Amino acid sequence: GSHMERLTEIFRGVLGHAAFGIRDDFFDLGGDSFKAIRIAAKYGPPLEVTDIYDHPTIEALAEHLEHASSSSIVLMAGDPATAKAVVVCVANAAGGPVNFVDMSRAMPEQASDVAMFGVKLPRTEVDSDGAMLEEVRRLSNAVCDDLLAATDLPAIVFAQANGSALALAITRELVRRSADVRALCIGGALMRTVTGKRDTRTDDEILAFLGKAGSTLPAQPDEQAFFLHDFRYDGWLADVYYNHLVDLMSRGALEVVDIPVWCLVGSEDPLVPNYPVRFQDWSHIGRPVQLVEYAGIGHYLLRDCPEAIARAVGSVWEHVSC
């Protein structure tokens, strides 16, 4: 029915109880990350997960929906009118712009000149690896189109682990169009040099992997279902694109871009513990390659030191300012 009526129905279904009003905070009574994703998915397209964080009440959220407006990116910090550069952020598997919330909230104090856009992951249904590669091309072109229509500022591409895959695509597209790309920043990932295997693991094996990486899996089976759908989809997409790039390398046909690459890694990351020798493999994509090492931190830099990641993005911009 109405905006607030659908919001109240979805909130009562997702939170557990019906004793809920339109002025109560979403987080002060059990709301979170997964529940916000589930809410944004059930409500429909025009609601984004970040709008629940900027508007954790049903009335304010419905007002936002009134003057709301489809884009492939979402503005998270700064304003392109006053800014000197923009940063396009791609999240890890099962993620999205939400992953950068904290980081965005640190940008005004760590990179005041830089605006932040987050890439939305539609997860379009496809029936083949070739269709998946066509979808990677379509999505990278959509992100580039929306970015070049949103701003004409120098652009930095930031990637979170698995998101690196899509990030690479975007960067390369932006070079084909001779757009103003000045840096590729990648967190908690390494360039893939060998053809990869497809993810045939069980849900429990994924839970163990995420425990090893330092993350817990949600308990609600619907939240788990959405998380695992997105996780396996993103893994498939990234595997396809990295295998394409590795084939290009095998034949010597991967062009090196004159764009610097920053590799931000936590020192205690159990997923890339061989980085001291492998981080330099980003030379296949761009040069020079710079390493920033965060001591005592694991894989999830955006969870454990988001302010420092904003600081790294500001540093990258000032390094490529002139």
Numbering used by the authors: 2656 to 2724, 2727 to 2979
Which lines from the publication concern this structure?
We determined the didomain PCP-TE of SulM, in which the PCP was in the holo state loaded with the pantetheine cofactor. Additionally, the protein construct was derived from the C2818A mutant, which will be unable to initiate catalysis, with a goal of capturing the functional PCP–TE complex. The PCP-TE structure was determined and refined to a resolution of 2.73 Å resolution. The structure contained two independent chains in the asymmetric unit, each containing residues Glu2660 through Cys2979. The two chains superimposed with a rms displacement of 0.4 Å over the full length of both domains, indicating that the orientation of the PCP relative to the thioesterase domain was the same in both chains. Although confirmed to be present in the protein prior to crystallization set up, no density was present to warrant inclusion of the tripeptide mimic in the final model. As such, the pantetheine is modeled as a free thiol. The pantetheine reaches from the PCP domain into the active site, positioning the sulfhydryl 4 Å from Cβ of the alanine residue that replaced Ser2818. The remainder of the pantetheine tunnel is rather hydrophobic, with Phe2866, Leu2867, Phe2884, Phe2888, Leu2928, and Tyr2957 all bordering the channel through which the pantetheine approaches the active site. The complex is rotated ∼50° from the interface observed in the structure of EntF; however, both thioesterase domains direct the same face, the β2 strand, the helix that joins the β3 and β4 strands, and the lid helices towards the carrier protein and the trajectory of the pantetheine still allows a common approach to the active site.
Nonribosomal peptide synthetases (NRPSs) are responsible for the production of important biologically active peptides. The large, multidomain NRPSs operate through an assembly line strategy in which the growing peptide is tethered to carrier domains that deliver the intermediates to neighboring catalytic domains. The paradigm monobactam antibiotic sulfazecin is produced through the activity of a terminal thioesterase domain of SulM, which catalyzes an unusual β-lactam–forming reaction in which the nitrogen of the C-terminal N-sulfo-2,3-diaminopropionate residue attacks its thioester tether to release the monobactam product. We have determined the structure of the thioesterase domain as both a free-standing domain and a didomain complex with the upstream holo peptidyl-carrier domain.
